[PDB]
Structure formats: C-alpha cells, structure tokens
Homo-oligomer: 311 residues x 2
C-alpha cells in the first residue's frame, strides 16, 4: 500500500505511516503539475493533498483503488466531494487545528497596520531613523475602537477574545446570530459603525466579492480592513481605490488573484500590509495538521471510522 | 514668563499655556544640539523636553530661573534628577497615559517576530510568493508559551493582560512581589523557563546592560526577546551573536546606540524586527501626553502640587 503526499510536511507525523509498513511518497518542491499528480496518484491507496492540488474526478479515476483523501487543510473546496462519494472514497480534513494561529496573525495584521509596524521597520532599515519625535509614525490607539467581525465561527470568536484584551469593543454580523456577549448587526450597520472590519466568513456565491466598491466606501473614513479568510471576498481593484485616501489601511493575508503579482499597486501602498497566506503558519499548528491528516488516513485504511470526515 | 518645548507636539494642548498668557517657544525639526538648547533655555521658567534632550546641571544653571522640567515621556533617565532637586527645580513626567499604547506595540512586535510578518511582507513584495506550502515561513505558535516580564509596572501588567488572551502563561520578576495573579520569580528563574522575555523596567546604573551576553545565552534556545523599554538594558552586540543561532528572534523598539545605524548587523538578521522607538506613538496617546505635560508644568508655575512628580 502506497500513500501520496503532494507536498513536504513539517514534523515527523508521517513516520507513523512508515511504522505501519505503508510506503510514503512525498513530493518535493513548490509546484505539482496536474500531469505529474495523475502519474503519481495511480496505484495509491491513500492521498494527502493541499489547497494547491485540484482533486477532481479525473484524479480519482486515475487513482484506481484510492480509499481516502485526507486533506491537509480545513477547507475542501479543491476536492470534488460528490465525485469521491460516487466512488466510495472517504474524505477528511483538519478542523479546529489552525484556529488560534489564524487568529494570532489576524491580530498581528491589525497591529501591523494600526501602529505602522511594517512601515516603521522599513523606516529604520532604510536609514531614515534619525531621532525620536513626538509626531513620528503616529498610528491608531485601539482602546475604545470597535472591531466588526463579518462571520463568527471559531476563528472570528478567537479574534474577538484577543481584541477585548486590547480594550476594543466587539460587534459582528453572520448568517445566523450566536449566544455571544456582543451586539449582532446587519452587514450595513456593521460597516457603518466599525473602526476595524475583519472578514471570517467562507467564500460562496453570496459572499463572492462581498467587500465590493460600494461596501468599501461605506466603511468609515479612517477605517481598517482585515482579511485572513479568502481573497475573493474582496474586490482587490476597489480596495486600491479606497486605500488612496478613504481607508486608514488594510492588512491582507489572502488576495485575489493569489499570489498577488509583485507589480500590483497594493504593494506600492504603505498603508497596506500583505502577507503571503501564512495565517496557519505556526510550526506546531502545521505539525498538528499533519498528525490529524495522518490519523484520519490511517483510520480509514484500518477499516475504522475517521474522526474528521467530510464524506 | 517663557516656556520652551523642545519638539513640536501633536494636538493643541499647548494652547492652554498660551491662553494663560505664557510665551510658548516650540522648536521645529528633528534635532536640537545641546549648544542650541543652552542658548534657548536661558530665561525660561518652564521646559518640556523629550528623551532626545539631555537635561543636566549645565542646562539647569544656564536657565537661571527654571522652576519645572515637565517631561514629555514616562522615562526620565535623560534628566539629572539630583541636580534638579538641589536647585529646587521640580521634575514631572507622563505615566499612565501611554500605558496601553506601549503595551499594544509590545504585542505587535511579539507577533511580528513570532509569525515573521515583516519578513513575510518582504517575501511577497520581492516577488518570491509563488504558492502556498506547508513549510513556508513557519513561525512560533504563542499558545501555551510562557511570557516572562522583567519589571511589572503599569505597562508590564497591560502586556500580561493581552498575552493571556493569546493563550500565554505569565510569570514575572521585580524588586519585590506584587499583589498579582502570576508566579513571582527571580531573574535567573525567569530567564530559564520563559519562552518570551519582555523588558519593562527603567534604566538605572543597576539595570544598565541587565540583559548581558551571559543572560542572553541563559535564555532558552528558541526564545524571543522583546525590548520596548530602554536600549541600554541590552548588550546589543551580544544580542547579534545570540540571534545568529540561539534565540528564535527579537522585537526591539529601542536600541543601543539609538538610532541604530542602517549598516548594523541586526538589520541583516530577518529574525530581528526593529522599530524606531514608536512604543507610545498612538495619535491620541501622544496628544494626551501633551495635555499631561502641560498640566504638570502649569501646576508648578501656579505654586501647586503637580499630579505626576518625580522630583
């Protein structure tokens, strides 16, 4: 029995598979052309893909004998679930594991923008730092400001908890209210009253470019936009427009398109902080994700019910 | 009666002094040579300096009539307190008003280092971002980690409150135990068990180079050092050696020397994030510090006790 892992993983979670007599094939590098995936997948009983791998019907048919697709991620939009179901293939993911890490970086971006940390680091690095001054790199004090969360799942709730510790007030909008000690608002009122808007809602036809030109300019002048969820939730070109003078700034860990090309105007805006989708990039988090994917995969191969099934 | 303000301040706090009939001289620019300070302080009854202005006996004797030195800062290591006392000159500062802003920046630096945010921004900006990968820009998850505060005044306590929301454990060291819900440890014990060490103590002959070579290497391999207090508290050169292969990283808002020249080795270490001493650079905070400095100066000139005296 051979298992295909589309990318190298941190930690030694895979050793468990090797200990079980399973043959582990781990693909090295930043890219995996669909052509090479099809070649490597045939004959494999188990598969551990990433969000960068399109696991469609073709891949499944090519993998005559595939029993489980243990996703190295919480999201599974890159896997044709119905195609797998129709083929008796189990599909699992890694829920819960990256919540705190994603929340942490969300906060890191808020602080990075609000207090001009990235900008300040460049200022010192480039030799512009000559002395301390009362008006140098003034940012926004967070105390008393309102953080408006769009989507209140586990990550959104983790972000709210952190925000409260910085003296921020919290409000939120979601498809459904929740028993939380925060005011539930319509998207319209949230954009109107929030000093900082953070996105934490899944991407769907309804949320595709939710933060369009009209909503971005509906936010208060001097507001900050944060997005560590899905790039497509924001109309990138419109964000550039709003950043020239309306919005205080924006912190993005996800973009559209993604990756965001080097010559894109957002990179030329000092009030924009763009990180390369590293929201879950905590070493322990990434190793934990590996352990969970491995557990799910072994579970299915041992004729047991996996702990985090999608199908 | 003339009052000399050594740097321009944000906000209109100074108008209060003008409304009282006081002549207000405010120096513009990033520099104020001592020879220039001496020339302008002569005949002044009040002085509002910054950490950039060394107020020693020479300055005091040149004024010939100075009644109060209302510091626009919380730290006063740049003022000869004993010289002022022997001359009957009052010295005040601005504590409390900058507590939350400084705590925010401290957390910003921790997240910036731990999650490699500044480095990540550069990665995307330079055009190296080509795909998402399980091992790209892996950082340190803060959950479960111990934060050791050396010095537990208002800022240290404010930092602890925020750290707890990120899932961190808090321990601290100070001259004597305080009525706080955290383990009290000796400096030695703290350095040994803390994953993140943050300095929050004033600079004095006893705290000069507190974090020397021996103590920096006494910290855990993989630990993070934060310094938003005073640069001279750390042996900068030893810090460089420790960052090459022992410590995970360091977040510094203060350095020695300050400013730290751009050719300094620390700027070439990606696991070091240096900001230009912007800890209290929250716009509202800086305007409030101005109001507080003004209230203290006016109080002394009015023959009444100032709210935040040091001398």
């Amino acid at each position: 029995m051979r298992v295909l892992v589309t990318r190298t993983l941190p930690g030694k979670a895979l050793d468990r598979l090797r200990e079980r007599g399973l043959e582990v094939e781990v693909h090295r590098g930043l890219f995996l052309p669909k052509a090479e995936l099809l070649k490597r997948v045939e004959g494999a009983v188990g598969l551990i893909p990433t969000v960068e791998d399109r696991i469609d019907a073709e891949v499944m048919d090519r993998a005559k004998g595939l029993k489980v697709i243990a996703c190295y991620s919480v999201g599974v939009d890159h896997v044709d679930l119905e195609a797998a179901r129709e083929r008796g293939i189990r599909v699992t993911h890694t829920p819960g594991v990256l919540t705190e890490a994603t929340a942490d970086l969300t906060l890191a971006l808020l602080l990075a923008v609000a207090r001009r940390v990235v900008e300040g680091a460049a200022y010192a690095r480039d030799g512009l730092w000559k002395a301390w001054h009362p008006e140098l790199l003034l940012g926004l004090d967070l105390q008393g400001l309102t953080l408006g969360l769009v989507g209140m799942g586990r990550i959104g709730q983790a972000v709210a908890k952190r925000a409260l510790a910085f003296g921020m007030r919290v409000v939120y909008h979601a498809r459904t209210p929740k028993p939380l000690p925060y005011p539930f608002l319509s998207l319209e009122e949230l954009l109107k009253e929030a000093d900082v808007v953070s996105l934490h809602t899944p991407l769907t036809p309804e949320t595709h470019r939710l933060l369009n030109r009209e909503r971005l300019f509906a936010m208060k002048r001097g507001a900050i936009l944060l997005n560590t969820a899905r790039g497509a939730l924001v109309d990138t070109e419109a964000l550039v427009e709003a950043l020239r003078g309306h919005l205080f700034g924006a912190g993005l860990d996800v973009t559209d398109p993604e990756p965001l090309p080097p010559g894109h105007p957002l990179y030329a805006l000092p009030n924009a902080v763009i990180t390369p989708h590293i929201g879950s990039a905590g070493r322990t988090t990434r190793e934990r994700m590996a352990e969970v994917a491995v557990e799910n995969l072994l579970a299915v191969l041992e004729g047991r019910e996996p702990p985090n099934p999608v199908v």
